[PDB]
Design a protein around this nucleic acid. Structure first.
Ligand SMILES: *[C@@H]1O[C@H](CO)[C@@H](O[C@@H]2O[C@H](CO)[C@@H](O)[C@H](O)[C@H]2NC(C)=O)[C@H](O)[C@H]1NC(C)=O
Ligand SMILES: *[C@@H]1O[C@H](CO)[C@@H](O[C@@H]2O[C@H](CO)[C@@H](O)[C@H](O)[C@H]2NC(C)=O)[C@H](O)[C@H]1NC(C)=O
Ligand SMILES: *[C@@H]1O[C@H](CO)[C@@H](O[C@@H]2O[C@H](CO)[C@@H](O)[C@H](O)[C@H]2NC(C)=O)[C@H](O)[C@H]1NC(C)=O
Ligand SMILES: Nc1nc2c(ncn2[C@@H]2O[C@H](CO)[C@@H](O)[C@H]2O)c(=O)[nH]1
Ligand SMILES: Nc1nc2c(ncn2[C@@H]2O[C@H](CO)[C@@H](O)[C@H]2O)c(=O)[nH]1
Ligand SMILES: *[C@@H]1O[C@H](CO)[C@@H](O)[C@H](O)[C@H]1NC(C)=O
Ligand SMILES: *[C@@H]1O[C@H](CO)[C@@H](O)[C@H](O)[C@H]1NC(C)=O
Ligand SMILES: *[C@@H]1O[C@H](CO)[C@@H](O)[C@H](O)[C@H]1NC(C)=O
Ligand SMILES: *[C@@H]1O[C@H](CO)[C@@H](O)[C@H](O)[C@H]1NC(C)=O
Ligand SMILES: *[C@@H]1O[C@H](CO)[C@@H](O)[C@H](O)[C@H]1NC(C)=O
Ligand SMILES: *[C@@H]1O[C@H](CO)[C@@H](O)[C@H](O)[C@H]1NC(C)=O
Ligand SMILES: *[C@@H]1O[C@H](CO)[C@@H](O)[C@H](O)[C@H]1NC(C)=O
Ligand SMILES: *[C@@H]1O[C@H](CO)[C@@H](O)[C@H](O)[C@H]1NC(C)=O
Ligand SMILES: *[C@@H]1O[C@H](CO)[C@@H](O)[C@H](O)[C@H]1NC(C)=O
Ligand SMILES: [Ca+2]
Lengths: 776, 776
RNA sequence: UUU
RNA sequence: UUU
């Protein structure tokens, strides 16, 4: 950070630099500002003020800031229902005239979420991007668009919908956008639009008309858009069954009415989204002149019958992605899957998703139309309530990256809300997985209670198997997964593993990662034999996760591995296994010879009995003891951890630091003490601690730091030093620290905002960075 | 509390009165004391000082306190391993001489957990009870027992064991206790005792010799104890398999050796505990002269074979309780249960526990020896890894109160640690269920994935069924429980209920309480139809618990009941169902016409949209909105809840109270605002709020309270007012409050200890009750 | 802070 | 705090 020494440390904003674009970026996101801060550098190019309470903008706002290419002034007055009900914006944002017209270089302007009533005027002709989402602008008129000749990108959505209502239909003047001769992207989503606006500039590449009241498309509506690549008409005549938002369908179960010739102009179309349009038929004719369609979304329609027919697919040999999820006929539970022969035409297909078709049995041959699709990578059949499926059918799908049968009822990545989101592409005010192991079979959240070898016959190619969230209550003995000779990752979390036998999992001879987290069930009942020593047999295991198992007893006293590097053991009861006076489990982790990372956070350890560190394995580097309620800690015992580099002690009740950190651990690089009860440092704390790089003392109760505790020869090595949310006393005794804080180049986050005096007197609440201690 | 106005409010101890015994009880438990407090009333009879740091006792300690009948001075210096590792006691408690000899009326003295080295001398002859547990007294000599002639009760345990070791065998002089001619109870547990001390006073009623190194009983050892009622020899030659403490068995798997005539003197014996004695045989001869034995514990032995034989039981026709739990042969999994014919002799038997026998199949006829035990109430067969059991066999057990099959592997109240506790009867430093509905079948924590009517065929008598913690993933439709016509309580928690059908549970026509908590599984996946309106059909349902289900969607918009009085709905996502601008679920609870208690805590409600309170059902009395992260609350809306009496708003972020509580809710009796961010009250807050009785403002950030906020005509009605852990400013502006706090008789808990100034100056940390504001 |  |  030598380039940053020119800028003031008092600025409550994060400053960064894109060298080679000569951009100075300044980020004042969510800093509780009522004024643009004075201090913003003259050379600032990208300025972000989103999530603040600046009530107006004037020519004074940006007078000095002549180099601005981008202003992000979003969410300073968000509509009532979109916003905080504690911090309700009293009055819309006021933009006085001539506020932007002076910015010759302004390429991007964001004014979303400010309750604006009309399109801001006075905008410079250099402007390429204008964003006005989540305002109250519901009438577009040619008169208002006169200064936007150079505009390429226009975002006008979310100005009239259930969360920001305008109480009328959206109005666009005939030809409103036609004279914007460089317009590439236009978004009119979530707006109560009733007809496609015409005529649109032929230069458009992307048009978003989704979530509106458009009941019909005219054959003329997209006539001239011969450069269009993305069209989204989704959510016009929506499918409302289980919608998690208020939802009015078109009268009489009617689909969005699209004439057969309506897409004929669209020769460049790559992407077509017709999600939630209540479609019953997909006429093949639609696609006659679209030869390069790559992505097609037909989810949330009523296309169950069509999936069995689907003549349209013969016209899509370059399609990469096809989504037909959630097309089930209400109240019907089909016996089986009827996939059309036509799916065999989809020669370029990489991703097929057919969630929510809703059927009882998947027979091997019902996916045969896909067997010869050479490029198919993902087949998603989740959320189908499938009860029966012979998994061996996926031998015909070795070439796939992912076979997803998540959320079904089988017995012997996309975001969680996705197909049922109102607008999954919506912008927040804040901003603008084992697949890498190879072939993956995802059986998570099914009803598998018992597994046996024969279940995985013909699946020896699998690299990752996800059995998370089944019902498996079995004493695994090393015979259940015998065919999975190539398996590298197994997720067995959220089952009810019964570790009676130490031969469990031994047959997975290439296993690298095993997750048996959240199998607490048998660990919670007394008198049950549990063998934690099963690790010995897994000869290439690197990572073992056994979190949230409530482990408080083990019949074996040692875990052993020649290979394991990482062990997550959080949310167990090491406090019970290491009860004071009981030596038996002090060497629990000692024979994990290659162990470098150990997480024993959330284990309810008020104290560590002696023996614990001596019993750690010799290569331990990363140790977490976070969130244990620790109240004391013999720092001297760190001498036993000769390779320790990171010690996470956050979120405990430690009241002291070691007298001499260098006499405790020569190797220690990162020490994390945040959220403890430390009231003072020790006199020579960091002395001679040359190896230290990172030190978090944030969220403690520290009053004073003196120079002897914090020698410069150490501090100037620190990559980072965190000191915020402490109880700093700002008397003349604190003068070294106050001065040092003001002048050091050591990185201290939240320095301007949250390193604050608690006293005395009128110093309360005042940043230490701004403090003038002229009498000391 | 008029009797209590005589005692000082500054006393950091709870004072109470047993009228009619003329006892004044004073409790200073855990108040961080280094001195006995001055202020303890002269008439104090029972004084408790446990869990403090008083380093010595002298004649000054109790000079004034001449009426003391009981001193509880435990745990002022607990042994290192038993105690806090943060607050380690530096030095044993010092008892200077003549400290007790002046107390003519002292009947009970507790000095446990003070690292004492010898038995305290100078004790008054009125003493009936002396307790010295958890000290370092490991040699008993007749010389030391000279002042104890009147002693009835002596507790000497926990002076030499794995958590407080003495490093030698315990020593008792021959005849040590013989001359204590009134000794009734003697406890030598947890002491490294190697032989039964002889000869013991014949007046003994209870003798606790458990958890020791006693390998043999001599035929003479209990010769003269013809009044003995309780004998505990447990844990001498322990069974160590899966012991959760360090455990050395007697050499060569050897049992505790008890001669066949060893109990012949014990004609009064009611209770015999032989838990964890590695017994292989129970010779019938032991019980020849014990005709009134009521309770017998033979758990944690090696009696699996003996349970199939068991001739000793013919000699126990008055036995009420028999425990044979955890007798399995290591490494053996029996095909079935072999119960001896002899169990049919147990004519008085009420409770039989046979956990941990460990067998695969329970056939109907294998319990036939119990069929004609007329008084049998509890049959406990938990933790047996039973895989098969025809539940209809319990038609032969209609008369039982509880049939417990908890923790087995069946596919189509004791504390948690109990049989594996080191000492389940141990004293803490601090102190010294659906069964009521009728017949209960507990199938919790089994492997039941599917249920059907025929499973419950001859079980129509059941009143309570616990299916908690099975694997049930089924769409219940009202046919699965048809035979359970008399069922009143069903616990279906920790399954995976799939509420597709609104007919679920309708067949349980007499159902009063239904628990479907922790069935979150299908609620977490989008697009799944869920019918919360199933409540309509259950015509006598009183209480419905549906906690921690993560509910964020429902196909139905209303829950309906003519009968339901309590609904627990905590740990769901009402925030999503009541998203601002979505009206559809604002009447979710409206048609629960008789609903009086609603818990919607932990539902992630930053705010309540309007409509919520209007949509509450008309008889709502008890509402919890705790732990929601609420940041604002329109108090005026409480007008809609015309019968509200309790409002729990604890653990939120509210920053204000209503301007006028009486203009918000005339009916409100208990208002709970603890753990919020309230900084000041409103000027007339409680004015005219005559109906208020309970008000918790603890753990806020309150600086000042003025008289206008807190009128006396309201306050003097308050049963309780909580004000602790606030941020009180102690200036002259606070004078009304400081004075009022000092003189009111309103109950304010923690007044002496935790109502404290934060400022200004040297007032910091000082109790407001002690504050002298003489200049105001 | 005798479990 | 546009989900
Ligand atoms: C600073 O603002 C400029 C102008 O809005 C951003 O420029 C974009 O940069 C990306 C890649 O970095 C290009 O693909 C876009 O074409 C540019 N947009 C325009 C309108 O010119 C720049 O990225 C911003 N930088 C930061 C770090 O926020
Ligand atoms: C979308 O526009 C419609 C009409 O095109 C709005 O509906 C009108 O709203 C007012 C106030 O609720 C009613 O008095 C009228 O009856 C409605 N008219 C019709 C024809 O429905 C609607 O509010 C707009 N939607 C949003 C979300 O703003
Ligand atoms: C109970 O007494 C035994 C012996 O009676 C103690 O064992 C001795 O302990 C010390 C230190 O562990 C050894 O050096 C001795 O050699 C042991 N002697 C024998 C005879 O075993 C034991 O420590 C005592 N137990 C407790 C818990 O205090
Ligand atoms: N944990 C477990 N133990 C079993 C089972 N079946 C028999 N056992 C035996 O039960 C005892 C306690 O777990 C041990 O002796 C086991 O060998 C089972 O399914 N799970
Ligand atoms: N919740 C649930 N829905 C099912 C099941 N089988 C079919 N469905 C159908 O799937 C859709 C979503 O639940 C509804 O139309 C249901 O009728 C099942 O086992 N559970
Ligand atoms: C599925 O297709 C088969 C023939 O391949 C046919 O018998 C059946 O009617 C189809 N099912 C439905 C529900 O349309
Ligand atoms: C499942 O299919 C495979 C052929 O891929 C066959 O080996 C196996 O026997 C089938 N099992 C069942 C239960 O249908
Ligand atoms: C297994 O499935 C669950 C989704 O049901 C998911 O949370 C988990 O991440 C998956 N595992 C892996 C390794 O991706
Ligand atoms: C209270 O103590 C006094 C002084 O020792 C005694 O005279 C008086 O009788 C006691 N009161 C009662 C009710 O015992
Ligand atoms: C259980 O008793 C039967 C006879 O009723 C006997 O044949 C069987 O072997 C017994 N089992 C064992 C393990 O002793
Ligand atoms: C269980 O026993 C009952 C007799 O009480 C009988 O009705 C039934 O056939 C048995 N059920 C099974 C599944 O064996
Ligand atoms: C059901 O059993 C579990 C023990 O697994 C217990 O938590 C629960 O309290 C029992 N339910 C009732 C109503 O007693
Ligand atoms: C469940 O469905 C209906 C109840 O409405 C019933 O007639 C049917 O027989 C039931 N079937 C099963 C298999 O539970
Ligand atoms: C539950 O709601 C659904 C539709 O929302 C309706 O079909 C059904 O009749 C309702 N059932 C009851 C018992 O109220
Ligand atoms: Ca200055």
């Amino acid at each position: 950070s030598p380039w940053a020494r020119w800028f003031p440390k008092t600025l409550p904003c994060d400053v960064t630099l894109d060298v080679s674009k000569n951009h100075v970026i300044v980020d004042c996101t969510d800093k509780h500002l009522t004024e643009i801060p004075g201090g913003i550098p003259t050379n600032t190019t990208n300025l972000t003020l989103t999530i603040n309470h600046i009530p107006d903008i004037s020519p004074a706002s940006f007078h000095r800031l002549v180099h601005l290419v981008e202003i992000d002034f979003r969410c300073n007055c968000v509509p009532i229902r979109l916003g905080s009900k504690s911090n309700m914006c009293p009055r819309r944002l006021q933009i006085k005239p001539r506020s932007f017209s002076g910015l010759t270089y302004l390429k991007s302007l964001y004014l979303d979420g400010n309750q604006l009533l009309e399109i801001p005027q006075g905008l410079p002709p250099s402007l390429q991007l204008l964003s006005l989402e989540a305002n109250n602008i519901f009438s577009i008129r040619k008169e208002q668009l006169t200064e936007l000749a150079n505009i390429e990108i226009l975002y006008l959505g979310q100005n009239c919908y259930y969360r920001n209502p305008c109480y009328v239909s959206y109005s666009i003047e005939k030809d409103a956008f036609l004279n914007l001769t460089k317009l590439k992207v236009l978004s009119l989503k979530d707006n109560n639009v009733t007809t496609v606006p015409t005529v649109l500039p032929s230069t458009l590449t992307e048009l978003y008309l989704y979530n509106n009241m458009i009941a019909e498309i005219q054959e003329d509506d997209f006539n001239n858009l011969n450069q269009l690549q993305i069209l989204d008409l989704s959510g016009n005549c929506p499918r409302c069954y289980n919608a998690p938002f208020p939802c009015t369908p078109c009268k009489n179960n009617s689909p969005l009415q699209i004439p057969v010739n309506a897409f004929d102009a669209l020769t460049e179309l790559k992407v077509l989204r017709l999600h939630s349009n209540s479609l019953q038929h997909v006429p093949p004719r639609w696609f006659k002149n679209i030869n390069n369609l790559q992505e097609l979304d037909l989810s949330q329609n009523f296309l169950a019958k069509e999936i069995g027919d689907a003549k349209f697919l013969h016209f899509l040999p370059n399609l990469i992605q096809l989504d037909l999820s959630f097309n089930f006929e209400l109240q019907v539970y089909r016996a089986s899957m009827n996939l059309s022969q036509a799916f065999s035409s989809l020669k370029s297909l990489k991703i097929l998703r057919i969630r929510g078709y809703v059927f009882k049995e998947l027979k091997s041959f019902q996916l045969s139309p896909l067997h010869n699709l050479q490029n198919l990578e993902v087949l998603d059949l989740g959320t189908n309530f499938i009860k029966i499926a012979n998994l061996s059918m996926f031998k015909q799908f070795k070439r796939l990256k992912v076979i997803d049968l998540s959320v079904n009822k089988i017995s012997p990545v996309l975001e969680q809300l996705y197909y049922f989101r109102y607008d999954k592409y919506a912008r927040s005010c804040r901003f603008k997985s084992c697949y890498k192991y190879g072939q993956t079979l995802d059986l998570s959240k099914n009803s598998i209670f018992f597994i046996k070898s024969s279940d995985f016959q013909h699946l020896s190619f699998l690299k990752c198997l996800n059995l998370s969230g089944n019902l498996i209550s079995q004493t695994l003995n090393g015979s259940e997964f015998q065919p999975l000779a190539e398996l590298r990752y197994l997720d067995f979390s959220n089952n009810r593993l019964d570790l009676l036998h130490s031969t469990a999992f031994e047959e997975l001879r290439k296993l690298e990662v095993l997750d048996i987290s959240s199998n607490s069930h048998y660990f919670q009942s007394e008198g049950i034999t549990h063998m934690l020593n099963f690790t010995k047999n897994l000869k290439v295991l690197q990572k073992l996760m056994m979190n949230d198992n409530d482990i408080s007893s083990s019949t074996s006293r040692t875990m052993e591995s020649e290979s394991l590097r990482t062990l997550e053991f959080r949310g167990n009861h090491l406090d019970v296994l290491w009860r004071d006076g009981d030596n038996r489990y002090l060497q629990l982790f000692k024979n994990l010879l290659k162990l470098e990372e150990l997480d024993i956070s959330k284990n309810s350890l008020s104290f560590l009995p002696s023996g614990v560190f001596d019993g750690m394995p010799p290569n331990l580097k990363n140790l977490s003891l976070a969130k244990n309620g620790l109240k004391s800690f013999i720092w001297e015992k760190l001498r036993y951890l000769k390779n320790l580099e990171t010690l996470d002690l956050s979120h405990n009740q430690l009241t002291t630091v070691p007298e001499r950190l260098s006499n405790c651990s020569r190797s220690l690089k990162n020490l994390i003490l945040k959220n403890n009860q430390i009231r003072s440092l020790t006199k020579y704390f960091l002395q001679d601690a040359f190896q230290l790089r990172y030190l978090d003392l944030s969220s403690n109760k520290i009053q004073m730091i003196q120079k002897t505790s914090f020698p410069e020869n150490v501090l100037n090595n620190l990559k980072m030093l965190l000191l915020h949310h402490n109880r700093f006393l700002c008397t003349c005794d604190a003068v070294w620290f106050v001065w040092w804080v003001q002048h050091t180049e050591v990185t201290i986050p939240y320095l301007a905002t949250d390193v604050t005096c608690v006293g005395p007197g009128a110093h309360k609440g005042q940043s230490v960075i701004s403090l003038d201690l002229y009498t000391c």
